[PDB]
Amino acid sequence: GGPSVFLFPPKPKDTLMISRTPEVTCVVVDVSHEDPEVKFNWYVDGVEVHNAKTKPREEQYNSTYRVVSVLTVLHQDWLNGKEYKCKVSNKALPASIEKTISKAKGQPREPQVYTLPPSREEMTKNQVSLTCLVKGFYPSDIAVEWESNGQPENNYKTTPPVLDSDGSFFLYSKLTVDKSRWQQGNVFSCSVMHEALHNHYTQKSLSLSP
Amino acid sequence: GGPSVFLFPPKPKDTLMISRTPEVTCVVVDVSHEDPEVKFNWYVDGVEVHNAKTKPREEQYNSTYRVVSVLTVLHQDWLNGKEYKCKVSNKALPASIEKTISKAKGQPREPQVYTLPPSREEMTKNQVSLTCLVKGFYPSDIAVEWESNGQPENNYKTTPPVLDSDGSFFLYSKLTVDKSRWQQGNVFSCSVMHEALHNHYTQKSLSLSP
Ligand SMILES: *[C@@H]1O[C@H](CO[C@H]2O[C@@H](C)[C@@H](O)[C@@H](O)[C@@H]2O)[C@@H](O[C@@H]2O[C@H](CO)[C@@H](O[C@@H]3O[C@H](CO[C@H]4O[C@H](CO)[C@@H](O)[C@H](O)[C@@H]4O[C@@H]4O[C@H](CO)[C@@H](O[C@@H]5O[C@H](CO)[C@H](O)[C@H](O)[C@H]5O)[C@H](O)[C@H]4NC(C)=O)[C@@H](O)[C@H](O[C@H]4O[C@H](CO)[C@@H](O)[C@H](O)[C@@H]4O[C@@H]4O[C@H](CO)[C@@H](O)[C@H](O)[C@H]4NC(C)=O)[C@@H]3O)[C@H](O)[C@H]2NC(C)=O)[C@H](O)[C@H]1NC(C)=O
Ligand SMILES: *[C@@H]1O[C@H](CO[C@H]2O[C@@H](C)[C@@H](O)[C@@H](O)[C@@H]2O)[C@@H](O[C@@H]2O[C@H](CO)[C@@H](O[C@@H]3O[C@H](CO[C@H]4O[C@H](CO)[C@@H](O)[C@H](O)[C@@H]4O[C@@H]4O[C@H](CO)[C@@H](O[C@@H]5O[C@H](CO)[C@H](O)[C@H](O)[C@H]5O)[C@H](O)[C@H]4NC(C)=O)[C@@H](O)[C@H](O[C@H]4O[C@H](CO)[C@@H](O)[C@H](O)[C@@H]4O[C@@H]4O[C@H](CO)[C@@H](O)[C@H](O)[C@H]4NC(C)=O)[C@@H]3O)[C@H](O)[C@H]2NC(C)=O)[C@H](O)[C@H]1NC(C)=O
Ligand SMILES: [Zn+2]
Ligand SMILES: [Zn+2]
Ligand SMILES: [Zn+2]
Ligand SMILES: [Zn+2]
Numbered sequence: 283g284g285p286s287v288f289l290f291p292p293k294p295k296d297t298l299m300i301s302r303t304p305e306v307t308c309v310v311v312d313v314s315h316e317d318p319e320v321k322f323n324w325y326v327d328g329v330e331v332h333n334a335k336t337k338p339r340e341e342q343y344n345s346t347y348r349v350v351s352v353l354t355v356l357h358q359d360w361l362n363g364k365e366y367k368c369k370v371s372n373k374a375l376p377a378s379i380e381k382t383i384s385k386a387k388g389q390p391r392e393p394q395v396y397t398l399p400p401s402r403e404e405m406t407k408n409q410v411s412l413t414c415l416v417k418g419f420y421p422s423d424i425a426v427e428w429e430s431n432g433q434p435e436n437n438y439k440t441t442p443p444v445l446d447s448d449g450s451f452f453l454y455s456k457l458t459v460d461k462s463r464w465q466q467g468n469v470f471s472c473s474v475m476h477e478a479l480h481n482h483y484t485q486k487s488l489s490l491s492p
Numbered sequence: 493g494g495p496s497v498f499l500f501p502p503k504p505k506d507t508l509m510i511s512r513t514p515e516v517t518c519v520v521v522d523v524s525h526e527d528p529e530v531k532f533n534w535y536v537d538g539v540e541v542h543n544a545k546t547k548p549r550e551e552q553y554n555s556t557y558r559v560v561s562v563l564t565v566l567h568q569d570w571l572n573g574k575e576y577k578c579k580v581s582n583k584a585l586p587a588s589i590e591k592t593i594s595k596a597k598g599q600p601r602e603p604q605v606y607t608l609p610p611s612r613e614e615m616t617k618n619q620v621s622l623t624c625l626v627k628g629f630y631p632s633d634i635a636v637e638w639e640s641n642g643q644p645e646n647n648y649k650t651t652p653p654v655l656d657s658d659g660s661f662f663l664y665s666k667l668t669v670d671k672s673r674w675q676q677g678n679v680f681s682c683s684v685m686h687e688a689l690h691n692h693y694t695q696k697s698l699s700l701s702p
């Protein structure tokens with residue numbers, strides 16, 4: 283019946299690059315028309331804060347308003363497991379709605395990042411697959427990119443993180459490049475972002491072995 | 493309000509091994525108590541069939557019955573895209589409920605299966621990762637297993653299928669073995685089941701390269 287609140291973490295890579303600006307987004311839906319006005323309270327670890335930016339309310343094609351409040355989080359605060367509560371109040375609910383969010387909890391484990399060259403049997407086609415193996419990481423939040431002399435290789439696909447038998451995650455990234463490039467001798471680098479890396483970043487280069 | 497019908501495909505590997513017995517399962521839920529009796533109709537491509545086996549009805553801890561009907565499908569019929577309709581009738585619904593199911597549609601593409609040996613940089617620890625790369629397959633339904641001299645290696649994890657830039661899927665399987673075994677010279681084989689393989693099966697062996 284009453285409104286419903288949803289609270290969304292920042293983008294993983296906004297949290298891992300200190301130059302970016304991570305945000306937590308509080309969304310209330312099913313805002314009626316009779317009792318439309320809603321109040322946001324915000325708390326960082328149970329202490330009230332006032333720097334949130336609420337958006338002007340919008341009307342939905344089901345006879346309902348939508349109101350979003352955005353709060354910037356600090357890079358260190360997010361990574362240090364600080365907890366972000368959004369309180370939503372409306373003279374229509376029996377009581378207020380509270381939703382709390384933080385970064386995935388758990389002891390962090392630093393990834394091991396490995397590059398693997400094409401298979402022997404695959405050395406037949408004109409396009410080949412370059413493999414990044416990333417293993418032993420925790421939490422599951424991660425980002426992977428491939429690059430070659432400055433520019434980005436964007437012909438890649440990365441698997442979702444897979445929960446591994448020790449409680450850590452792994453994944454693979456597959457870079458597809460024209461084979462002549464592999465033989466020419468191009469440098470290809472898989473670059474990984476994860477909290478548990480030094481400065482949340484590492485790079486591994488792959489090359490035609492002599 | 494009325495009952496709800498759900499219709500479930502067979503297990504992927506039941507469909508890929510001709511010795512097994514795939515089944516489609518029709519589940520109706522929200523069966524009331526006042527109007528409890530339900531009738532299953534079944535059709536293979538719009539033609540009625542009578543070999544389904546309905547289970548004796550069970551009562552749910554929300555004041556509702558659950559009734560399941562199971563229909564065996566033929567191996568060839570399933571793989572040839574035959575369509576399986578379950579009709580559910582009850583003197584309580586404004587009208588009957590029909591749900592139709594078949595194998596994932598689309599032109600089949602045969603996987604390319606590749607085994608990759610541990611990374612140079614990973615050759616430091618006492619456990620190593622063996623990689624099966626399976627690529628270019630369609631539909632996404634697939635099964636992967638590792639084995640060594642007869643017995644199954646069960647210390648493996650396989651990624652979900654990832655949709656690749658050409659419309660085909662890929663995935664990787666990661667076999668973890670003690671490093672001494674890699675150096676001793678053990679044969680390790682990744683065995684893949686997919687519709688588009690000859691007899692829905694192939695095998696690729698991986699060994700310490702000399
Ligand atoms: C009236 O219409 C209302 C909507 O208006 C309309 O517009 C459309 C939605 C359309 O569908 C029309 O219906 C209509 O015209 C409608 O409101 C809707 O209600 C639903 C439920 O009642 C809501 O469903 C929830 O959705 C969540 C995900 O929503 C995201 O994804 C969808 C698309 O996939 C999208 O529509 C949403 O906008 C939202 O997108 C995300 O938005 C945030 C904020 O912008 C982004 O994050 C930010 O991104 C920016 C840059 O964009 C930047 O990166 C910031 O840093 C960052 O913060 C995301 O990027 C963005 N994602 C995407 C993909 O775009 C679901 O998670 C939620 O699931 C929950 O409940 C499920 C069961 O329903 C359950 O399965 C699930 O577990 C989950 O439960 C919670 O969550 C945890 C799991 O994650 C659990 O562990 C917990 O148990 C539980 N939480 C707790 C503690 O309780 C759910 O499905 C729907 O979002 C909402 N629609 C909108 C638009 O808000 C309303 O219902 C209608 N009225 C009536 C009468 O019904
Ligand atoms: C009263 O209580 C009822 C239940 O009794 C109780 O028991 C529990 C369920 C408990 O939760 C208690 O609540 C209660 O005590 C309750 O009924 C429930 O209603 C729900 C919806 O109203 C149903 O939800 C649906 O579930 C589907 C998946 O269900 C499977 O998985 C769950 C566990 O994850 C499990 O509980 C189910 O039993 C079922 O398991 C699968 O079962 C089949 C059959 O056995 C197996 O297949 C067979 O397996 C055998 C060997 O086991 C062999 O291999 C055979 O070959 C093979 O056939 C599976 O192996 C098995 N899986 C698992 C993991 O065990 C969801 O898919 C479904 O989603 C649909 O709707 C969603 C939104 O709700 C939507 O997101 C989604 O897209 C989807 O929509 C359809 O599907 C397509 C996507 O796949 C879409 O493309 C289509 O658009 C759409 N279809 C179309 C064409 O319309 C949904 O969530 C719930 O299952 C049901 N509970 C049970 C137990 O049946 C009832 O609601 C209560 N009453 C009231 C008043 O509410
Ligand atoms: Zn304030
Ligand atoms: Zn807390
Ligand atoms: Zn380090
Ligand atoms: Zn930092």
Ligand SMILES: [Zn+2]
Pocket residue numbers: 541542543
């Ligand atoms: Zn009959």
Ligand SMILES: [Zn+2]
Pocket residue numbers: 575592
């Ligand atoms: Zn049809």
Ligand SMILES: [Zn+2]
Pocket residue numbers: 602689690
């Ligand atoms: Zn073949």
Ligand SMILES: [Zn+2]
Pocket residue numbers: 510567568571691692
């Ligand atoms: Zn066959």
